[PDB]
Paper text:
[name] is a recently identified Acr that inhibits the type I-F [name]-Cas system. Interestingly, [name] was predicted to be a dual-function Acr and Aca. Aca proteins are transcriptional regulators which commonly inhibit the expression of acr genes by forming an acr-aca operon. [name] is dimeric and binds a short inverted repeat sequence in the acrIF23-[name] operon promoter to repress acr expression.
The purified [name] protein sample was successfully crystallized and diffracted to 2.5 Å. The crystal belongs to space group P6522 with one molecule present in the asymmetric unit. The final structural model contains the complete [name] sequence (residues M1 to S228). The overall shape of the [name] structure resembled a bird and was composed of three distinct domains. The wing domain was formed by five β-sheets (β1–β5) and one long α-helix (α1) at the N-terminal part of [name], while the body domain was composed of six α-helixes (α3-α8) forming a helical bundle fold at the C-terminus of [name]. The head domain was formed by four β-sheets (β6–β9) and one α-helix (α2) was localized between the wing and body domains. Because the electrostatic surface features are sometimes important for predicting the function of a protein, we analyzed the electrostatic surface features of [name]. This analysis showed that [name] contained a highly positively charged cleft in the bottom part of the body domain, although negatively and positively charged surfaces were evenly dispersed in the [name] structure. B-factor analysis showed that most of the head domain had relatively higher B-factors (average 88.25 Å2), indicating that the head domain might be flexible. PPI analysis showed that the complex formation significance score (CSS) of the MolA/Sym1 dimer was 0.2 (the score ranges from 0 to 1 as the relevance of the interface to complex formation increases), while that of the MolA/Sym2 dimer was 0, indicating that the MolA/Sym1 dimer might be the biologically relevant form. However, our intact, fully folded crystal structure of [name] indicates that [name] can be in ordered conformation without binding to Cascade.
Author numbering: 1 to 100, 105 to 228
The structure:
């Protein structure tokens, strides 16, 4: 009857069980941090991974909701007075020269309010290199800004709960602790001092530079 952890998710059994149809069950609750997500009444004869699996659909649609809810803005390349979209690019930040003929392409916002700027192809290229969003940028939709900021005066190290958004096989990147450690050039043992049940008594937290470098290597947030 031990509680189960899938990255930042938690499935816990209630303190006392119950009989249902003469057999012992327990109600298990799915938690995303403090948010209660789902309740299911499960036979005690269920293994741990039987409990775990019964909730993996509700988790999957959470992810789906988050990939959409936090998807980056998208820019569109069209011919100057052309008629089709020639390319699209997701961008984690908008170009500062956007508003309402020497140039042969327009870079357009894919959503209203429509902002545009005229660009040569080399200009479009430089912009996309600079601004392109990385594959898992939507995970930043779930982390607090104190953790994401490059302002060393306001930066707060992530908690193990926040770290588990991005490392751990049940995390939203799927990338395990041991792989994460190698990215940072540390031992698996040393990196796991940051993500543990007892990590509150581990005085060494992840460094500002390691964390932002990590988020880049995992494809969550460009170091720029």
């Amino acid at each position: 009857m031990n509680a189960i952890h899938i990255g930042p998710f938690s499935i816990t059994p209630a303190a006392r069980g119950l009989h249902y149809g003469g057999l012992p069950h327990h109600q298990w609750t799915l938690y995303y941090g403090p948010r209660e997500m789902a309740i299911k009444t499960l036979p005690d004869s269920y293994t741990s991974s039987e409990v775990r699996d019964e909730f993996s659909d509700i988790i999957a649609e959470f992810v789906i909701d988050a990939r959409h809810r936090y998807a980056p803005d998208v820019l569109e390349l069209v011919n100057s007075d052309g008629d089709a979209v020639l390319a699209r690019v997701a961008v984690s930040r908008l170009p500062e020269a956007l508003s309402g003929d020497r140039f042969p392409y327009w870079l357009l916002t894919a959503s209203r309010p429509r902002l545009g700027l005229p660009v040569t192809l080399n200009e479009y290229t430089a912009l996309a290199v600079e601004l392109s969003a990385p594959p898992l940028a939507w995970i930043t939709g779930l982390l607090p800004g104190e953790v994401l900021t490059h302002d060393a005066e306001e930066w707060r190290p992530p908690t193990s709960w926040e770290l588990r958004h991005v490392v751990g096989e049940g995390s939203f990147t799927g990338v395990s602790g041991a792989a994460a450690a190698a990215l940072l050039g540390m031992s698996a043992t040393n990196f796991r001092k940051y993500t543990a049940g007892d990590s509150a008594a581990n005085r060494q937290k992840i460094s500002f530079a390691a964390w932002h470098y990590l988020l880049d290597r995992l494809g969550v947030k460009r170091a720029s």
